[PDB]
Structures are given as structure tokens and as C-alpha cells.
Amino acid sequence: MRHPIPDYLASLVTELGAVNPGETAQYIPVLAEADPDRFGIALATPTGRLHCAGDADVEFTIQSASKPFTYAAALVDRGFAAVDRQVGLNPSGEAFNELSLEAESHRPDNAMINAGALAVHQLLVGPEASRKERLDRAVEIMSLLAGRRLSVDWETYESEMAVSDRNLSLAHMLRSYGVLQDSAEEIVAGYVAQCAVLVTVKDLAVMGACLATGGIHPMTGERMLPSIVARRVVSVMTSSGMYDAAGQWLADVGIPAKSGVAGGVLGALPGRVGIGVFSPRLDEVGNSARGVLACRRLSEDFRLHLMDGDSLGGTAVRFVEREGDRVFLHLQGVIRFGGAEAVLDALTDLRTGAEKPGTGWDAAVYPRWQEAAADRAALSAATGGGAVHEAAAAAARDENDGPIRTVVLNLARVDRIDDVGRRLIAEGVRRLQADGVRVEVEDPERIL
Amino acid sequence: MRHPIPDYLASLVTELGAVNPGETAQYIPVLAEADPDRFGIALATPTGRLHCAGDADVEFTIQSASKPFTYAAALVDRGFAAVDRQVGLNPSGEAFNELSLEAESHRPDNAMINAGALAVHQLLVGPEASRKERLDRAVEIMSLLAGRRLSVDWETYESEMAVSDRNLSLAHMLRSYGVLQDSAEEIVAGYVAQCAVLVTVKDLAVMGACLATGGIHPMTGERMLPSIVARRVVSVMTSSGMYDAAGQWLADVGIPAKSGVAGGVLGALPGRVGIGVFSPRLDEVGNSARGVLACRRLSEDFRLHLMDGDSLGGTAVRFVEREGDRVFLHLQGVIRFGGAEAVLDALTDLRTGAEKPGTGWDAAVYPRWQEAAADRAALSAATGGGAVHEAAAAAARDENDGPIRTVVLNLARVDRIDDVGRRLIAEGVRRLQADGVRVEVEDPERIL
């Protein structure tokens, strides 16, 4: 059987391809002359799958969509403190206002706008880094997430340098306020080479998935970035990626994205998918007309929206077996706060102490809450509490004949657990034992 | 054993309670005179749990934290088109600029700022609604999510009406541009009564959980709001809740929130938790000083951040049994796009047709991707692919002796599935059958 997603994308490529409004970036003939009759799209999943359609293998310069990756590299190289002194986190339009550096911050609003990107490139390797090392670092970071060595289209680069007065303007102003240390020319050349890196819709989809997973490359499972860094980058993409239209975009689409003037659009939805879209023509605000509409379609059709919750929750608890004197608690999935919390609930739902729980709420005041609580299993399926409810059941009628002396924690089905989950679950175990309960943690591949 | 979360909150209440900077809302003596030595916090989970600490049972007027609930009610009553004509989705500071209505929109920036809230209240029941019905509707919506009948503190209301010149200013300007139809006085009285509704930290935590779950009340499992409406509301809380500091707040905290001048702060993290915080004193920008810091602490300590992905993913697939000729595929959790997608992958990972799959990528170009793909199980645990990999295994060495004639889909462990998931999974089944494979869907409580 053939995967239905790629077909959906094919349908999408045909439908939205019925028209092709807007126009190509006019500033450089290399872009103004590029074939406008191209439209490709790719989805890279968290687990390592890649569904695509249309011109998804056609190369184009990444331009502004490079901004979150260099921002990423800079944060890893210099740390948060050093980057935050030079780059803010405030959303703004690309139009430059000097007042934005006159603030006691003395720094560009954010990493998505040009002035902010120029400051990022400057911080790329270290204070004593050479022009060549910073570019290589830019190209490297994008290449490591793309999974293949990328190249700089020097034809576009040259075309761009011949008309880089605006960026030179930004860089000079920035030097003026001490945000840039090196020459305006040097930093602009580096940022322009950076924007000339060649990628395909597929490359972007994969690169976006690395951010979407929290820094893990979906095709290898190797950590390419710290989860904290990926988080920051996706944060700024969401609040600043679409400049002054970021709010409207957050509400109608909900997909952290950033587009480039060559027709490319990058997306990254935490825990769900990396997206690459390509369509040469841009709308009135400078974004890829179809690329942007393709993202709105994916969101509405699949409910792929940042605000549409999708957590493991109680499903962290595979099941609860009250074999007899001993209780078996198996866990599964990617355990973080959500799952850890549910686990702690299952453990507490066992009578391993004088059961004098604090209902949290007054049954007298909330009769409905009591009624709903009665049908433990129904209430769980309506919210989504996996098998956590099986704990209260084990500590139910079965307690009527025999206490609980042993609890076995099986983690075989658990893929991985973050620190928060590890600390919460560990404490849970520590507190169970304190109840005179024996606790054995069966953990084949030492994950705890 | 005692639940570790409430203790963590207790620790948090004690630590941050070491100091109490800022000051109480000075505009009305009722608020300027309120005891500042109070600090409470509550967390309401998706499954129906409630962890709290400190003064979490103390009532205070909800003020601005009422804005997302009335916005919610208005969207349900009038529909999106009618509300969007009057209320925008653009982030802005509370400072009012007339230019914001001179735009061809002719509407306030968003529902989180006063002018935007006045427009929302006006739309509350319908065009022919009376003053009393709109207030009742406001009080009702907040009451249905809180789970108990709430009351308007008329003492605060009176205190406020005596100094409502600013809001009267807004309402009058809004009437000027036709955003309000009724009198400035009438709408301001309604909005002020609205802000005087009494709630506790716990009430807010529960109310926020309803939004966090997509509209489902965590204590009953009853749908209180459409998922689309809850989505919009949380979208605007994130982009506009903290006005011009929304970007910075999105990055350092990542919790959709809105605070009120009485010390209350409401939070709502999709798929994870509802939050109520209370601390009378406000900082320089008007938010609850400790309430705001409490949210930053919860985010950093538990990694409770909108951009920190937490999905079911491959865990939607409980397991894959290749008993013999027949294959058993059990699903679980809250199946949406993420889980549905993984399911479709499992199905495709079975050879039920001439296996001429499109790797998506060239093995020659990506040697590392091939290597990682080889150890199917390792790669899955590194990204988090639950049991989807068990499908390729069933279609592995076992195919070497016998094809696959029957596939059994068990949904017993699945809590619920949205439309997107239902359409994707249904198509998967439709396409399996087309391969001459028998497919039986064991679904006890008809969920499909």
C-alpha cells in the first residue's frame, strides 16, 4: 500500500498550483529571471520519514531561512549571555528604526530581521574568528542538519554583493552602536554568502525536523543541538518569523516558519514535523505566496497547529497489573513532565500508606466532579489518561484481600526520558520505598 | 506516598515568597488596600488532578484574566467572521493609538487589550442582547469552566465605576468607528462587572486546563468549547497576553498566560496543564510580580514550554504481532495527526504489495542515514518511534515463509481519535484491503 501523506501533498501541489500570483524577487536578475513555474513541498517526520511532492529536489538559495540555523550555531558557540547582549527577542518589521539601538540594550530586535542576522553572523565562531571561519561555521551548521555538505551559489552571491547597500547600511549603523566589531563590508559578505547556500525543499524539511525534535536529527537519532538552543530558535521563529504579521500567522497557521526571497519556506512544529516548501513568486509582503498558503493548508487540513495539544499524558503508563501481592507497572513513550506526572499519579493511586488523600476539591461543592470521578475509566478516555486509572483499580477490590509489598517498574517499552522525568520518577520510587514497599526497576538498556 | 508536585509548589511558594517587590493596584482603594502578604499557586492537569500550595483558596477579582473566556464565548455565539470584523489578532501595548482603528479594518488590535475586550463584551450574546444577558453570559462561560457558579464582587465593581474614565474613553472612540453599537456607559459597566468576577488560584488553574485540553473539562471529560475556539483563544494569549513583551515572554517562559491587576495570573499549556497563580503586588508593567516569576520557574524547572515538544508519535502503536499468517496491530493514546501518521507508517512497513518503496532519500548520498536505518529499533528509541518498527520486523524474516492475508486493528487501548486521525487511519485500512489483505477492526467502544 502507498502512503497517503505524499498523495495528499500531490493533491495540494496540483490544487494550489492552479494559479501562481505575486512575483519573483526583483532586486537581482538572477532571482528575477528564475523560472516561476516550480512548486515543491516536503514533510520530514520526527521518526525519520520523508513525504514529498512536486519540485522538492530543485535547489535554490536559502536566504532568510538561514537565520535560525546561524542563530542556533551562535548560541552554541558563544552561549546565551553573549548572544543576548547583541540580539534581542522582540518582534518587529524589517523596516529599520534607529530607536531600536538607542534603547539601553543597544541591540537589534531579534534574529529574524536582517540587522539581527548581521549581529548573529558576527558572533558565529568567537571574537578572534576569521571571515572564512564564520562562513564555514554557517555552512557547516546548515549542512549538519541537512545531513549533506551544502554549497554556496556564488553566482547569486556576486549578483547580491553588487547591490548590498541596504545591508551595508545596517552593518554600519550596528558598528556605530558597537554591535559589530569587524568591518561592515566583511560581515555583509559573510551574511550574503550565508544566504546563498543551496538547499532543496527536502533539505529544509529535514533541517526543520531537527529543531522540531528538540535538536535530534530524525534520520540518525544523533543530537545535533542542545534542546534549550533549539527551543529558543523555534521560539523566535514563531514570534518574529513573520514580522508584524506574526500574531495573525500564529492564530490562522500555528506553524513556526520563516521564508526566503528565493521562494523557500522553512517550518518546524515541536514534536511533530519539519517542513520545506518552494515556490519562486512572493506576495506583497515578500514571502513565498504558495509556500505560505501551503502551510496554512497543512495546518487546517491536519490540525498541525502549535496550540493543538498532542501529548503522551497518561499513556506513559502502558498498564498496571496487580498479579497478587506484587504490582507490575510498565511505562512507555518519551517520558517528560507530562508522562512523569501521570506516573506519579499512578503510584499515588496505590494505597501504600494511610490513604488520607487531599481530593484537591470538595465533593460537596462539586457533585459533578464526583460523579465523573466514579467512572474512573470513562473519565480517563474523555481527557486521555492512558492506563493510569488501572492503578486505583489494583489498589481497589484487590486490596480488600492483601496489601502491596512489591512494585516492579518496567521501562523496557520506554524510548527515552529527560532529566525532569528522571528526577520526578526517581523521587516517586524513593517515596514508595519509604512506605515499606519493595521496588524493583527492570531497566534493560539503563535509561533511568 | 505523597505526590511530589504539591511539595515542589510548596517549596516554590516559600522560596519566591522570601520577598514581595512591586505594589498593589493603586487606582482603587479596594485593591490598593488589599493584604499584599498572600501567595498561592495551583496546577490542574489534563486528566483531572489538582496540585496546589499557599493561598490557593483565596478569592480575588479576575480582572483582565477574564478576557480569554469572554473572547471564547463571543466566538461560540457569533462565529469567527462576526468577531474578527470587530477584533483583530495583532499584538500591541495597552497604550491606545487611534491609528489602530483608522486602518481599513477599523478594529482594535486584539482581545487581550482593553479596547479589544470592550468590543468582545459587546458581541457577547447577539445583536439584540440586553445588558443583563451579556453579563450573565460572561459570568456563565467563566463559571462553566471553573465548574462552579461564580459571583461578581460588587464592592470592587462600584469602586471601579467611580473611576472608569479611561475605559469610557475607549468605548466612546470605539463607538465612533462603529465597533460598538450600544452606549459607552453600558458596555463599560458590563466589562467592569466582568472583571469583578471572583475566582481563586484553583478556579483559574481549572479554567486554564479547559483551554489546555482543547475545550474539554479535565474534571468531567465533557466538552465545554470547540477545539477550534480554544485554539484561537490560546493563540492570542500567547501572542498578545504580555503585550509588547510577548516575544521575550514566549522565549524565556513559553506558557500562554494573562494576568490581572488583582494579583491573579492564568496559564494554559496545550496538552499539559492549566495554571493559576496569585500574588497581589504588581511589577513595573502591571503584572503580578511573583505570579509572573512563578510561571518562569515552572517553565525552567519542568521544561513546561510551548516549544518543548511532547507528542505521542510512534507510541500510538502499542505493538505489532506477527502471530503467523495474520498480523495484530494494537493502537493506543489520543490519536491525532502525529499518531495517525505513525500508524500509516506501520501499515506501509508491511509488504502487502510489490515492495518498491520510495526511500525518499538516496542511500548513496546519505550513507549515515542507511547505517542508522539498519538498526531499526535503536533509531526508533533515539527519535521516539514507539512500536512502529515492529511492523517492518513482522514483514521481515517472517515473510521469508508465508505472506500476510489478515490484519487485525485493535483500538481497545485507544482513548479517542480526532477527525484527522479518523480519516487518515480509515484511508489506511481502505488501501490495505485494496492489497487483497483481510482487515478486521476490533473496536469495542465504537470510536472509529
Side-chain angles (χ1 to χ4, degrees), chain B residues 262-279:
Chain B
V265 176
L266 185 230
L269 188 58
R272 277 162 290 177
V273 60
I275 300 173
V277 188
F278 173 55
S279 181

Side-chain angles (χ1 to χ4, degrees), chain A residues 3 49 309-310 336 345 349, chain B residues 3 49 309-310 336 345 349:
Chain A
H3 210 295
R49 299 312 213 62
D310 185 340
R336 303 180 85 217
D345 281 347
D349 287 355
Chain B
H3 210 295
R49 299 312 213 62
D310 185 340
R336 303 180 85 217
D345 281 347
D349 287 355

Side-chain angles (χ1 to χ4, degrees), chain B residues 215-348:
Chain B
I216 305 171
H217 198 293
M219 304 300 154
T220 69
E222 174 203 1
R223 175 163 294 287
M224 309 307 287
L225 293 168
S227 64
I228 265 299
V229 170
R231 199 183 80 177
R232 171 58 87 65
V233 172
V234 183
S235 295
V236 172
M237 283 178 74
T238 300
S239 75
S240 307
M242 299 292 158
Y243 315 86
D244 285 320
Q248 178 112 186
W249 169 277
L250 200 244
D252 302 325
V253 186
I255 298 171
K258 187 67 199 72
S259 98
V261 302
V265 176
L266 185 230
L269 188 58
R272 277 162 290 177
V273 60
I275 300 173
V277 188
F278 173 55
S279 181
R281 293 187 182 184
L282 317 159
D283 52 45
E284 41 114 308
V285 297
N287 297 314
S288 166
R290 290 157 172 170
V292 128
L293 181 50
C295 286
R296 185 183 270 81
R297 275 296 293 266
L298 284 171
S299 179
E300 312 186 284
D301 301 341
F302 293 139
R303 296 305 295 294
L304 273 165
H305 194 297
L306 198 58
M307 306 306 201
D308 274 330
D310 185 340
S311 297
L312 175 68
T315 301
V317 190
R318 196 177 180 90
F319 64 89
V320 187
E321 295 286 308
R322 182 66 190 301
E323 186 53 291
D325 173 8
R326 24 166 49 194
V327 185
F328 302 74
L329 222 182
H330 289 60
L331 315 186
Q332 83 197 318
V334 175
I335 308 295
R336 303 180 85 217
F337 181 78
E341 189 275 314
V343 174
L344 290 172
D345 281 347
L347 294 181
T348 305

Side-chain angles (χ1 to χ4, degrees), chain A residues 1-3 7 49 238 271 307-311 318 332 336 345 349 383 390 413 416 431 435, chain B residues 1-3 7 49 238 307-311 318 332 336 345 349 383 390 413 416 431 435:
Chain A
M1 70 180 285
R2 298 207 311 155
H3 210 295
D7 290 345
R49 299 312 213 62
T238 300
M307 306 306 201
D308 274 330
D310 185 340
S311 297
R318 196 177 180 90
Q332 83 197 318
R336 303 180 85 217
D345 281 347
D349 287 355
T383 56
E390 277 170 41
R413 289 281 172 164
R416 51 158 150 152
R431 294 187 180 202
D435 276 311
Chain B
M1 70 180 285
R2 298 207 311 155
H3 210 295
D7 290 345
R49 299 312 213 62
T238 300
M307 306 306 201
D308 274 330
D310 185 340
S311 297
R318 196 177 180 90
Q332 83 197 318
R336 303 180 85 217
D345 281 347
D349 287 355
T383 56
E390 277 170 41
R413 289 281 172 164
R416 51 158 150 152
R431 294 187 180 202
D435 276 311

